[PDB]
């Protein structure tokens, strides 16, 4: 930790290249429009919300960047990737409006998007696909997302895929936000990877929402200490130009002592007093310091500002940041929250108008008018000139990539569609599918396999010799090894999954990890990924409650699909066979990176259990994609039922079908459900449409088109709701669901499948139970089956176990 | 960073108090039993799994702690809270066995616990309620959990609730694990809070699972750098005693230079070589370093050891941490991953026994026999004597608290059961309920309100003056303000929610935050909380997709209940009225902290929208707890339907009921469903039981004891699945569910409820459609309704919008 003063002394401060007076005129108009937008919204009295205080404290920081640093998307690259702090969006909108990129009607529709011509509260690409790029409002995700975005850009350059050398990633953060574990939890990574293309800009106004970050301390010093300790280049922008003479004249060095010893709480109090209170309680602490401003008027003392408000001090920091190599830079900008709002936190409106000399007359002020700069005016000319010299305007977004990829055909995965000689798993199938992709000339180098330390567990080792591990193991390595860091891996996956838009360079990531540590552990990022229109694959390996049998409670995943189904644009599958994996992966590739360019990403749970992999039935392709297809029909004269299974449990439902036929003469239709969720969604869509078109013939859910009315039983390696979600659409009077509800525990797969009541014996008992209630068989038959199969009818419900 | 040598010089380390030779014998026996336990498991060939290399590298560290530091639960306090590293559990089981706390049958049942007498793969209290205490296998959670556990102990002392001054929180971490953002993301909090009762013990074997943490770097230096920068006291245990002489004689300082410059990857290569190799490649780097061991034999050089394997160096480090005040201490213990096993890292284990001089011939090794010390032996006596001096054995756990609390009665919440004077929200109802509890003499001071910065947003600011904010706003403050850190707040919540077990001091936490940032953002901790038997309340504020209307995409929660239902012991409610909030909170209090002491925690979504709060219907209490009750029946001669709603949408479902009656003559039964999830679980439990007892009287789902067979419509502020989950149990042929599927966006509540097709008009159209289907009304009536209500039947599905 250094002294509580600017890192860059004035004698090392470069000359400011812009027109300070003109830029201030433009900046005031932006401040005004940002405030007008939020105020007009509040007048509606519709609890729309919107902030003003934050942007007022960081406006000048962004202004200097827009005028002298921010590089817009261009022919060579996607320009600088700016992770704008979420709630300062009104300021971004105000500037875009001034630049003529947004209309007054859009500003007037701030926070009213449903009808189409509005603006999102925060940066949401999904809602404004041509404007916003990075979802930052969920605090903490922006800083780590930015770290890996910068790492990914280095990756593209090192891989020889794209020269991203002129791109800088800017993460605009709040000091309170730095408390989120993900904000500083991965900063050492920037040092390990020498991310000199990453700049953290922490707005240090010393306050969070309901108070100071650390009133009894100094968060700027806390931030400096840990970032410095993490190997980052720390640049503190503490005081404005007005303090320079005072510091120079301070021979006793007592002023510096005073600045260092004062805590955030005290500074904040001076922040709400007056020049007299300052010279009295601040400078008046020591005669050396008190004498420094003795010949100063209370108004000249109150004029002393914080560095984050001085364009000159700001410029120096960003210039130094862009020159620095070998490590990432973090700029700690000292600002005043709610700057220039005085009474804040119609007289208030008049105050800001006067405060920033806004060109609005008393006659118009009541109209809460937006300010514009006429073409030909000095402001208009300068505003556009600076941007033009920096390649255009930002933020802006390209929804689709331009190049045409020559994707592998399903036939290219032919081997996976055939019966397998050796017993393998769906994870082995996944790896083989990847290998097929690594042979496709058009996308082989666009593939981005990602692992979180463990590769052997998922049989990814074979890939190492083929494409290697990115380790700028060398700079050309293709696989991203992020270590024990699922969130970090997810962020690399996200950067890769959205490269098609950000860099107009489609990259196809495949991140495989323990399924449990997916949505459950990085769920907020997965939701943000949907918002960011990510197109890639998330592979939940070692999935299924009973399948990762020895690991127990915190590893056995029987619910990730319940978490994944909450994301609108995530398509989830739980294949049982190798050929399904192939079909699903091929379809995903085509949908996301083929002509369609569908904005959706995939989640495929794979297994670590080997078993016989049969050949794909002819014509089953569509059913596999849709989510269900009839595997086969087993004859039986004493009864008829339908059996459904997915994942590792399907082969057990198949065993039950054979038992039912052989021991009870009960026939059955056996279905492989590759996706209960896609089926549920299709069903909901049909019912929704039917409800809205009462005069039309009811549409039929696909699952209802595949199934019949015979009593049905479904068993999965997931909690019952996973299969129960399609109940409404199953055309059968009876539909019993077996599932793995309850906490996992360590044991053999056989013991766990009996414990969770999902194995063959339970499926059989469930099936016989339905046939009994229909009179087709006597109840003693099921009671005898229960005894026969060593089933404990009175063991505690697994959910409670 | 400091030089790559021990922090504590030899002339500064205290005399080792233990019997080195005796301790090694005991340690070797533990090492043996641990290996045997895992080997016998693998023999079964049931893919049970289990690790050995990790415990081998940290075995000595734990041994010194068990012999001289770890305080077991005692009459005065819960003892030291040790977050044992998850996968080294075999070593803990081995010691427990040697202490006579576990039987041979239990060790032989390692990772096979379904039938009872077995052992969990890792620390899982839910599975082993009297043994394990803190779930640490999901890496990254243990370090944050520990930080907040330490802070909570400070809190209990400062609040005058319990003298926890004699307790120390030890977090045993892996170095690879430190890459998880959660691992270092909150370490500055330990400094802010001067957590000198917290000790992080990082096993620095330099390797994660598939490779080194940072092969071309120095992970220990990285760790020292950021922790030191965060204000922690860092103690490096680098080299064993054999190095002291070498370091002392080297007047050139070259050995230190050599140690500093050598990277992790090279040190690891040495480990796989021999004395000659080290002599040449390490000491041979410089003539001065070569000269230090010139008179040494290669064997002597090979004997040079890493500090983390030397009891004297380890002891010195833990003793110094014990003396350090003002902040937390991190011990960086340098170890060898595949320590003993070496070449390994059934008979090949003789190499293990040879190097650790294990008493067992190569004739009985194939038998993989366990080693035990008979009562009276020098080892047995020493083993127990050291533990007795430290108050007993650990880990151990107390499932229930001993004191009886005098909980408030429901009548104490009487004011909340009456009609409210003004329109309020369920969040205001929640705060008023908390106030009732704060008046109860028995639990007032055991309550732990927790917020993450935002308090005013949840109307919590009023409590700030009554009970204050914990700030050691003073050391007596009752409210925990954890800032913008949901994971941290969750960890404080967890520490409080499990104090009843850990300190035999029940504390009742109420953590309120933006519902979206609950399970979605800290879901892995919520799962771990269930495993830890947490008993507390999670309050998801500003919940419901359409209710937090202006916030948009990353704030509008219409799915947290879908995530919460995946946790077996989490009880979730989505109340619409203030009286329901009261009944639910009182019941939760009674269930968790009353005589029942049920191991479950509560999740209650509350709202930021005010509306009329009617009085509770007489006798509706149990129905509220169970999940559903009939509000009223409206007469109608043209038809009859059932209408269900929860949360903020219920009042709109009631509006629909009035419309149907007044405009279409359609009568209805209106139900408030306080918990679709509890109703779903009840139904699942009933059918499970029924199918398991085919000859007995079938149990009827609770929801089927409330609803009838008339066509039904349900609508909530959550995705359709939230209400569709009870389909199988709804005793009606038609059950249409409306929901908020799709990403949120900014607008008025009215526009969002129409966009998400959940408002009164959609409920009406849904109900009429059902009637039209059964010919009770003309299809034209439904079509006409759609037109009248300005419903766009061809609007894109909200899920895809
Ligand atoms: C994960 C998450 N939690 C909580 C919030 C709610 N929130 C909005 S503004 C705010 C405080 C902002 O403080 P800081 O990060 O210091 O930024 P400032 O506005 O002062 O620039 C909070 C907690 C959020 N957006 N995301
Ligand atoms: C969140 C999470 N991700 C992955 C794993 C799988 N895992 C088990 S052991 C291991 C490596 C452990 O390395 P380290 O933390 O360095 O400890 P060591 O075993 O070397 O002492 C991993 C990644 C886990 N337990 N938790
Ligand atoms: Mg701030
Ligand atoms: Mg390690």
Swiss-Prot record, chains A, B:
EC number: 1.2.4.1
GO molecular function annotation: identical protein binding; magnesium ion binding; molecular adaptor activity; protein homodimerization activity; pyruvate dehydrogenase (acetyl-transferring) activity; pyruvate dehydrogenase activity; small molecule binding; thiamine pyrophosphate binding
Cited function: Component of the pyruvate dehydrogenase (PDH) complex, that catalyzes the overall conversion of pyruvate to acetyl-CoA and CO(2).
Annotated Mg(2+) binding sites: 175, 205, 207
Keyword Transmembrane helix appears in the UniProt entry: no
Residues where N6-acetyllysine is found: 630
One GO CC term on file: membrane
Record's subunit section: Homodimer. Part of the PDH complex, consisting of multiple copies of pyruvate dehydrogenase (E1), dihydrolipoamide acetyltransferase (E2) and lipoamide dehydrogenase (E3). In pull-down experiments interacts with CedA.
Gene3D superfamilies linked: 3.40.50.920, 3.40.50.970
UniProt protein name: Pyruvate dehydrogenase E1 component
Keywords of the record: Acetylation, Magnesium, Metal-binding, Oxidoreductase, Pyruvate, Thiamine pyrophosphate
One GO BP: pyruvate catabolic process
Species of the source: Escherichia coli (strain K12)
Catalysed transformations (reactions): N(6)-[(R)-lipoyl]-L-lysyl-[protein] + pyruvate + H(+) = N(6)-[(R)-S(8)-acetyldihydrolipoyl]-L-lysyl-[protein] + CO2
Names of required cofactors: Mg(2+); thiamine diphosphate
Cross-referenced InterPro entries: PDC_E1_N, PDH/Transketolase, PDH_E1, PDH_E1_M, THDP-binding, Transketo_C/PFOR_II, Transketolase-like_C_2, Transketolase_N
Origin: domain of life: Bacteria
């Amino acid at each position: 930790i250094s002294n509580y003063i600017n890192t860059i002394p004035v004698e090392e401060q470069p000359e400011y290249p812009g027109n300070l007076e003109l830029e201030r005129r433009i900046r005031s108009a932006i401040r005004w429009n940002a405030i007008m937008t939020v105020l007009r919204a509040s007048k509606k009295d519709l609890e729309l919300g919107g902030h003003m205080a934050s942007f007022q404290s960081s406006a000048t920081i962004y202004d200097v960047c827009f005028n002298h640093f921010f590089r817009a998307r261009n022919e060579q690259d996607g320009g600088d990737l700016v992770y704008f702090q979420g709630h300062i969006s009104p300021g971004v909108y105000a500037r875009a409006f001034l630049e003529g990129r947004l209309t007054q009607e859009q500003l007037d529709n701030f926070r009213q998007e449903v009808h189409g011509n509005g603006l999102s509260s925060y940066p949401h690409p999904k809602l404004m696909p041509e404007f916003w790029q990075f979802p930052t409002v969920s605090m903490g995700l922006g800083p780590i997302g930015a770290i890996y975005q910068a790492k990914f850009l280095k990756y593209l350059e090192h891989r020889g895929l794209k020269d991203t050398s002129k791109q800088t990633v800017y993460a605009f953060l709040g000091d309170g936000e730095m408390d989120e574990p993900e904000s500083k939890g991965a900063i050492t990574i920037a040092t390990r990877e020498k991310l000199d293309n990453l700049v953290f800009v922490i707005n240090c106004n010393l306050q969070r929402l309901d108070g100071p970050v650390t009133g009894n301390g100094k968060i700027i010093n806390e931030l400096e200490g840990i970032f410095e300790g993490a190997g980052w280049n720390v640049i503190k922008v503490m005081w404005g130009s007005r303090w320079d003479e005072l510091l120079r004249k301070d021979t006793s060095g007592k002023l510096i002592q005073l600045m260092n010893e004062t805590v955030d709480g005290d500074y904040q109090t001076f922040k709400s007093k007056d020049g007299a209170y300052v010279r009295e309680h601040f400078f008046g602490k020591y005669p050396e310091t008190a004498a420094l401003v003795a010949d100063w008027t209370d108004e000249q003392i109150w004029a002393l500002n914080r560095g984050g408000h001085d364009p000159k001090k700001i410029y120096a920091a960003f210039k130094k940041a862009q020159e620095t190599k070998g490590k990432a830079t973090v700029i700690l900008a000292h600002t005043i929250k709610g700057y220039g709002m005085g009474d804040a936190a119609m007289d208030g409106v008049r105050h800001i108008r006067d405060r920033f000399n806004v060109p609005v007359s008393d006659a118009d002020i009541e109209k809460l008018p937006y300010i514009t700069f006429p073409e030909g005016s000095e402001e208009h000319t300068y505003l556009h000139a600076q941007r033009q010299k920096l390649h255009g305007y930002l933020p802006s977004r390209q929804p689709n990539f331009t190049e045409k990829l020559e994707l592998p055909s399903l036939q290219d995965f032919g081997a996976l569609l055939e019966e397998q000689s050796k017993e393998i798993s769906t994870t082995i199938a996944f790896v083989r599918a990847l290998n097929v992709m690594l042979k496709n000339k058009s996308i082989k180098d666009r593939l981005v396999p990602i692992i979180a330390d463990e590769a052997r567990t998922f049989g990814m080792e074979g890939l190492f010799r083929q494409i290697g591990i990115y380790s700028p193991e060398d700079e050309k390595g293709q696989i991203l090894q992020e270590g024990i860091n699922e969130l970090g891996a997810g962020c690399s996956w996200l950067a890769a999954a959205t490269s098609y838009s950000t860099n107009n360079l489609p990259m196809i990531p495949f991140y495989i990890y323990y399924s449990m540590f997916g949505f459950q552990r990085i769920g907020d990022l997965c939701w943000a990924a949907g918002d960011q229109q990510a197109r890639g694959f998330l592979i939940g390996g070692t999935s299924g409650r009973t399948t990762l049998n020895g690991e127990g409670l915190q590893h056995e995943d029987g619910h990730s699909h319940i978490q994944s189904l909450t994301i609108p644009n995530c398509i989830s599958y739980d294949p049982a066979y190798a050929y399904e994996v192939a079909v699903i992966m091929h379809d995903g590739l085509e949908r996301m990176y083929g002509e369609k360019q569908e904005n959706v990403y995939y989640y495929i749970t794979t297994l670590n259990e080997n078993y016989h992999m049969p050949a794909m039935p002819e014509g089953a392709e569509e059913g596999i994609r849709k989510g269900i297809y009839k595997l086969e029909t087993i004859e039986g004269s004493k009864g008829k039922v339908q059996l459904l299974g997915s994942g590792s449990i399907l082969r057990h439902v198949r065993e039950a079908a054979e038992i039912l036929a052989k021991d009870y003469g009960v026939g059955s239709d056996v279905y492989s459900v590759t996706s209960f969720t896609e089926l549920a969604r299709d069903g909901q869509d049909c019912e929704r449409w039917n409800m809205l078109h009462p005069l039309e013939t009811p549409r039929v859910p696909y699952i209802a088109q595949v199934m019949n009315d015979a009593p049905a039983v479904a068993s999965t390696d997931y909690m019952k709701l996973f299969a129960e979600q399609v109940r409404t659409y199953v055309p059968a009077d009876d539909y019993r669901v077996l599932g793995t509800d309850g906490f996992g525990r360590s044991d053999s797969r056989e013991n766990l499948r009996h414990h969770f009541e999902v194995d063959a014996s339970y499926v059989v008992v469930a099936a016989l139970g339905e046939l009994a209630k229909r009179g087709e068989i006597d109840k003693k038959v099921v009671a005898d089956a229960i005894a026969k199969f060593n089933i404990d009818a009175d063991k505690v419900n697994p959910r409670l176990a």
